[PDB]
Design a protein around this ligand. Structure first.
Ligand code: CHL
Ligand code: CLA
Ligand code: CLA
Ligand code: CLA
Ligand code: CLA
Ligand code: CLA
Ligand code: CLA
Ligand SMILES: CCCCCCCCCCCCCCCCCC(=O)OC[C@H](CO[C@@H]1O[C@H](CO)[C@H](O)[C@H](O)[C@H]1O)OC(=O)CCCCCCCCCCCCCCCCC
Ligand SMILES: CC1=C[C@H](O)CC(C)(C)[C@H]1/C=C/C(C)=C/C=C/C(C)=C/C=C/C=C(C)/C=C/C=C(C)/C=C/C1=C(C)C[C@H](O)CC1(C)C
Ligand SMILES: CC1=C[C@H](O)CC(C)(C)[C@H]1/C=C/C(C)=C/C=C/C(C)=C/C=C/C=C(C)/C=C/C=C(C)/C=C/C1=C(C)C[C@H](O)CC1(C)C
Ligand SMILES: CC1=C(/C=C/C(C)=C/C=C/C(C)=C/C=C/C=C(C)/C=C/C=C(C)/C=C/C2=C(C)CCCC2(C)C)C(C)(C)CCC1
Lengths: 97, 159, 42, 100, 104, 238
């Protein structure tokens, strides 16, 4: 490493467009209703469960709630979309292809 | 394919620490610099008081909720606070004897700040500084254990 | 003791001497035999 | 100097050479309210020496264990202080010989 | 931890919202803003398609109007949302909705 | 111009601009921003100087001195009295068996044949003679005040108001001259508050006829119901 003498402070080359665009690229397809959810959506059912579990705020969700499935799947896709958007943006600006 | 993140420490590739986000992210560096351990100009007794308050308050919880009298309604909190007081006392003893053992050789090399300017050694790292630091730790830790009990008694949503 | 044999320990003796012998005298001993081990020679 | 052209050895800068750095220390004198700092510099005034602190620790710990064995263990309602509350395993020595 | 060096070398590396290279209200479709919206004042996205603030003093008075309206409107948004938000939790207002709270 | 923690009042021993609100030209005045022309003799050098001499009674500097001493002595006596007119009633409503805790009736306890038990405890002072009490008091207070006005066993070459030797400043709270200067103001302000509240005790006795804590309690029961205007028609000329 002939470069990197002082650990640049901008180690994450931040683009504020990246989180917004990953969020919109995931949640908008996640707002498409499909046959498997009974016509509903993943984000729709996730927010529905968020509401149903905020109706008793202290009491957390159960093991049999289905809020955890929506949570984990939604955030799998969302984190993947956000990190791949950051990677793609900073590879486009930089080299990498 | 530019912009590598992980760098050698202060640009020295032969000292062997490898500055890294977990090490030198400005949020992390800021938070760790603002901790009383790294406030090298502040009196060690007061940094010890803060550290001791924090630790005595935190280490009462385990003794309260997981101790042998955790299932007795009013006795759980008392027993846990007293166990934490004893542990804080033991830790103050250990701190004292560490100050007796460690600070006898008086290192001679100076210190810098990853920028080039040499700073004075932390007075904490002397016999007197560590003794007053341990006194502060004892005072603050017993105070924080007492405050942990007080919070068991006065906080609205304590279970 | 009353008359059977003098110097019989009190009933509360174990409750005091088991903590003393197991928590305090080992603390004293380890602290002293820690300062003595790490003590530099002049 | 020490950062000029990969010259990581300086005899006039042995701090940068040996890696003697304060990676997170700040020497700012201002952290605490002065009345609070006064309160806590005076609270520890008596025990700010090694001997005084160890005297406090010895007194407190010995008093604590002694009052715990005399009073605190019974206040905690410990089973060793209550006693068996039963005839115990007295007459059941062995499966064969039921010894006292 | 390193000490951040002063702004003699760094007078304006952070001026993202001011100067000629500032964000505009149509992005790349704005072209160049009017000659008076030069990016010295906050929130200058170059939106004067009506030319109402072509005069500098009218522009100053409009900046005053905009900022005072902005503060009053922030207070108003929070004040219309908060009573209804806590009225959805069980705090018994007379009329928690804002366009009926005056008649309380 | 400052940083957050200096605004928040940290860092004791930064006090030289904190005397500016209690001494000097641009200090706090009796009508605040509506008191322009302070008397020229109220220069702001003495504690409690708010520029209030509407009646011009302190125009002579020497009578101003005498009035300052009168004020401070009255203030100290009134502070002791304000504390002593509420301590027995508080202690009696907390449960101490004081036989007459109301202050304007507390003197009539010595005429009961059980005497004047101090906290309602006969093993305590147990005074029966009001005349012997008064004689003891006269002797002691005469010695005490004659020692105050010229000097005595507790220091002779000391100040007439703030002697501050080892008998009257035995805790050393006033060795820092700035702490001394602001404690003077605290003294005179608490004392003026006590003098006003003792005037209030007097008037609330003559008017209401109950204890001061009883008045507080019946005011806190229903304030608009019961006030000083409740007793406004009491002194009706018949
Ligand atoms: C020798 C006995 C002697 C006794 C018993 C007292 C007793 C008293 N003096 Mg006193 N003085 C005495 C000698 C002297 N005094 C004073 C000058 C004063 C002043 C200027 C004041 C007192 C006040 C008092 C009262 C409050 C004491 C106090 O501040 O508590 C703290 C310990 C108390 C009745 C105060 C008072 O009467 O206010 C109610 C008051 O303002 N004394 C001088 C001149 C330096 C003395 C010389 O010997
Ligand atoms: C600040 C928000 C908050 C607060 C105050 C609580 C508070 C509590 N939670 Mg909840 N919880 C939270 C966020 C929060 N949780 C989140 C984000 C998740 C995911 C959960 C999942 C969760 C579960 C699964 C359970 C709790 C339970 C509890 C209770 C004991 C812990 C306590 C009332 C437990 C309970 O009492 O039921 C429980 O079983 N929580
Ligand atoms: C530094 C962290 C921090 C801070 C600033 C606070 C701050 C506060 N806590 Mg505490 N709390 C914390 C961590 C913290 N909490 C943790 C880690 C736990 C576990 C709790 C458990 C706790 C309980 C059980 C209660 C509070 C309450 C409160 C509030 C009292 C008013 C106050 C805002 C009280 C409240 O009103 O809520 C209360 O009853 N806290
Ligand atoms: C080396 C021989 C030896 C050994 C292995 C033990 C072992 C023990 N003693 Mg005994 N003891 C001894 C000699 C010994 N004793 C002698 C010589 C005396 C008379 C001075 C005592 C008087 C004594 C008392 C009064 C008590 C014990 C107790 C105990 C127990 C806890 C340890 C303690 O508090 O020590 C304490 C040791 C001393 C006070 C003196 C040792 C010298 C343990 C079973 C305690 C017990 O029975 O708990 C169940 C207790 O209360 N010991
Ligand atoms: C285990 C630690 C410990 C220690 C060292 C003591 C020691 C003492 N207790 Mg405490 N106490 C404890 C635990 C303890 N107690 C617990 C767990 C409870 C419950 C109590 C409840 C309790 C009461 C209610 C009283 C004491 C009293 C006393 C003193 C007699 C003595 C100093 C008494 C005292 O006078 O102090 C007293 O009134 N204690
Ligand atoms: C009454 C409130 C108000 C006022 C006085 C202003 C005033 C101003 N704005 Mg602001 N603005 C407002 C509301 C307001 N704005 C709102 C709500 C938005 C968000 C949509 C914006 C978004 C905005 C941007 C993005 C920019 C400005 C800019 C400007 C300046 C030049 C344009 C001009 O002369 O406007 C004159 C305005 C009026 C005479 C008010 C007319 C009100 C009519 C009745 C509204 C019409 C109906 C409406 C569309 C609904 C001027 C200081 C530009 C600038 O240089 O900023 C410093 C700029 O870049 N404004
Ligand atoms: C709040 C009221 C108050 C305040 C701020 C002061 C402040 C001061 N006085 Mg004054 N004084 C007061 C009331 C007060 N006094 C009263 C009531 C008396 C008559 C008893 C005196 C008699 C007096 C004398 C004779 C002298 C002073 C002196 C001083 C200075 C140093 C002592 C000090 O800081 O006390 C600070 C005050 C407190 C911290 C208040 C403590 C609250 C008490 C303990 C409550 C209980 C009262 C007690 C039961 C009643 C028995 C007496 C300072 C300017 C000395 C001086 O200036 O010399 C340099 C001096 O010589 N004062
Ligand atoms: C002003 C006068 C002050 C002196 C008063 C002396 C009283 C003489 C007398 O008869 O006492 C008689 C009293 C006992 O008298 C008892 O009083 C009780 C209330 O205290 C009850 O009223 C009993 O009925 C009564 O018998 O004797 C004592 O109290 C003296 C003991 C002193 C104990 C405190 C010592 C601590 C001193 C160090 C701390 C300060 C420094
Ligand atoms: C920029 C430009 C450019 C070009 O050139 C031209 C043009 C286009 C013209 C321009 C534009 C403009 C605009 C758009 C404007 C707008 C405005 C607005 C909207 C305002 C509001 C504004 C708003 C506001 C103030 C608001 C406010 C609010 C408030 C007070 C509130 C109050 C209240 C509340 C709380 C609730 C309760 O229960 C009642 C009440 C009493 C009701
Ligand atoms: C400033 C000015 C200005 C202008 O120019 C003019 C003028 C107006 C004139 C002026 C003013 C003035 C004034 C206001 C004054 C006031 C005073 C007072 C109030 C006092 C009190 C004063 C008060 C006081 C002393 C008080 C005291 C008290 C006491 C001792 C007490 C005693 C007692 C008690 C404890 C109780 C018991 O059981 C009994 C008795 C015995 C009762
Ligand atoms: C689960 C779900 C599903 C599916 C999902 C998915 C499959 C998702 C995906 C998602 C994704 C896969 C997303 C993506 C996105 C992407 C994007 C959003 C992109 C963008 C781009 C851009 C925006 C560009 C930009 C630029 C350029 C052009 C150049 C340079 C500069 C920049 C930056 C500007 C379904 C339907 C069955 C239903 C239910 C739910």
């Amino acid at each position: 490493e002939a470069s990197n003498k002082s650990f640049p402070r901008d180690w994450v080359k931040t683009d504020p467009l990246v989180p917004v665009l990953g969020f919109a690229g995931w949640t908008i397809p996640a707002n498409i209703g499909v046959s498997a959810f009974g016509g509903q959506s993943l984000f729709g059912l996730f927010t529905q469960s968020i509401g149903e579990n905020l109706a008793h705020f202290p009491t957390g969700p159960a093991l049999d709630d289905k809020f955890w499935l929506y949570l984990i799947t939604y955030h799998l896709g969302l984190f993947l979309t956000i990190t791949l958007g950051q990677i793609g943006v900073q590879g486009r600006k930089q080299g990498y292809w | 394919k530019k912009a590598q993140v992980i760098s050698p420490v202060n640009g020295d590739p032969f000292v062997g620490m490898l500055e890294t986000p977990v090490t030198s992210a400005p949020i992390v560096a800021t938070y760790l610099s603002n901790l009383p351990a790294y406030r090298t100009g502040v009196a060690p007794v007061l940094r010890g008081v803060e550290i001791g308050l924090a630790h005595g308050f935190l280490l009462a919880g385990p003794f309260i909720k997981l101790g042998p009298l955790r299932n007795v309604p009013e006795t759980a909190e008392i027993a846990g606070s007293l166990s934490a007081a004893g542990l804080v006392l033991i830790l103050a003893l250990c701190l004292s004897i560490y100050g007796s053992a460690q600070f006898q050789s008086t290192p001679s090399i100076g210190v810098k700040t990853l920028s080039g300017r040499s700073v004075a050694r932390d007075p904490l790292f002397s016999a007197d500084g560590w003794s007053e630091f341990a006194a502060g730790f004892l005072v603050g830790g017993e105070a924080g254990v007492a405050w942990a009990y007080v919070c068991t008694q006065i906080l609205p949503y304590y279970s | 003791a009353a008359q059977g044999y003098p110097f019989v320990p009190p009933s509360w003796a174990p409750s005091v001497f088991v903590p003393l012998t197991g928590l305090v005298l080992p603390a004293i001993a380890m602290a002293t035999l820690f300062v003595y081990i790490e003590k530099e020679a002049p | 100097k020490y950062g000029e052209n990969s010259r990581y050895f300086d005899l006039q800068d042995m701090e940068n050479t040996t890696g003697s750095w304060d990676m997170y220390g700040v020497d700012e004198k201002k952290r605490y309210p002065d009345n609070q700092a006064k309160f806590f510099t005076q609270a520890t005034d008596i025990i700010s020496r090694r001997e005084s602190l160890r005297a406090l620790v010895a007194l407190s710990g010995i008093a604590a264990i002694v009052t715990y064995g005399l009073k605190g263990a019974k206040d905690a309602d410990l089973p060793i202080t209550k006693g068996p509350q039963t005839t115990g395993e007295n007459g059941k020595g062995g499966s064969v010989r039921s010894r006292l | 931890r390193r000490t951040v060096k002063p702004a003699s070398k760094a007078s304006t590396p952070d001026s993202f919202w001011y100067g000629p290279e500032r964000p505009l209200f149509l992005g790349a479709f704005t072209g160049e803003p009017p000659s008076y919206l030069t990016g010295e004042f906050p929130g200058d996205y170059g939106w004067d398609t009506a030319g109402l603030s072509a005069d500098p003093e009218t522009f100053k008075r409009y900046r005053e109007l905009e900022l005072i309206h902005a503060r009053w409107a922030m207070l108003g948004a929070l004040g219309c949302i908060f009573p209804e938000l806590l009225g959805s939790y069980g705090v018994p207002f007379g009329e928690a909705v804002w366009f009926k709270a005056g008649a309380q | 111009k400052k940083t957050i923690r200096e605004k928040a009042g940290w860092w004791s021993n930064g006090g030289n601009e904190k005397l500016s609100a209690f001494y000097g030209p641009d200090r706090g005045l009796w009508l605040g921003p509506l008191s322009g022309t302070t008397p020229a003799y109220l220069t702001g050098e003495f504690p409690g100087d708010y520029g209030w001499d509407s009646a011009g009674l302190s125009a002579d500097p020497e009578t101003f001195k005498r009035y300052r001493e009168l004020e401070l002595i009255h203030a100290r006596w009134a502070m002791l009295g304000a504390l002593g007119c509420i301590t027995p009633e508080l202690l009696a409503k907390n449960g101490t068996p004081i036989v007459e805790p109301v202050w304007f009736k507390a003197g009539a306890q010595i005429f009961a044949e059980g005497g004047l038990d101090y906290l309602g405890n006969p093993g305590l002072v147990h005074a029966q003679s009001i005349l012997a009490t008064l004689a003891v008091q006269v002797i002691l207070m005469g010695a005490i005040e004659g020692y105050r006005v010229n000097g005595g066993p507790a220091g002779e070459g000391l100040d007439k108001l703030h002697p501050g030797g080892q008998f009257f400043d035995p805790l050393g709270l006033a060795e820092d001259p700035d702490a001394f200067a602001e404690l003077k103001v605290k003294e005179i302000k608490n004392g003026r508050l006590a003098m006003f509240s003792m005037f209030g005790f007097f008037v609330q006795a003559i008017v209401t006829g109950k204890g001061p804590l009883a008045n507080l309690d019946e005011h806190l029961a229903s304030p608009f119901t019961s006030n000083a205007f409740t007793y406004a028609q009491k002194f009706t000329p018949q």
